[PDB]
């Protein structure tokens, strides 16, 4: 049911910021702060931000119903980063790279 599948999916959060990924997760870890990175365009293009810190703090409060509502969030952080920046980005590598790790556990999810 959605409480064990969502045991599943605080295991993935967990994993996606543990140190194993950190070469790769740690853009991913807080909300973009665009004023501190001169995105000053960031809030205009992404307008629905999202970042692991938000998926941690929505799990912990029981905000998430499912674990379909859990992976469109996590989704949606990567899809921010395909829309803002060029695909050659080495942002939008690191995403590419926690994206394939994401994707593969969810996919594992149980019954
Ligand atoms: O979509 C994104 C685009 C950008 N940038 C900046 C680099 O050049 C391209 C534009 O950055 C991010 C980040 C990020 C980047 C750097 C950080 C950061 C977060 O938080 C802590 C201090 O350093 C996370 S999603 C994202």
Redesign the pocket.
């Known amino acids: 049911g959605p409480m064990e599948q969502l045991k599943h999916c605080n295991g993935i959060l967990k994993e996606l910021l543990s140190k194993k990924h950190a070469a790769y997760a740690?853009?991913?870890?807080?909300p973009?702060?665009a004023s501190?990175?001169?995105?000053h365009d960031?809030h205009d293009i992404?307008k629905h931000p999202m970042?692991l810190s938000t998926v941690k703090r929505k799990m912990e409060n029981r905000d998430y119903r499912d674990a379909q509502e859990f992976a469109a969030d996590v989704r949606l952080?990567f899809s921010?980063?395909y829309?803002?920046?060029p695909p050659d980005?080495?942002?939008?590598a690191?995403?590419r790279k926690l994206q394939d790790v994401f994707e593969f556990r969810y996919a594992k999810m149980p019954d």
């Open positions: 740690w853009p991913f870890y807080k973009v702060d501190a990175l001169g995105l960031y992404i970042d952080m921010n980063c829309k803002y920046n980005h080495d942002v939008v690191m995403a």
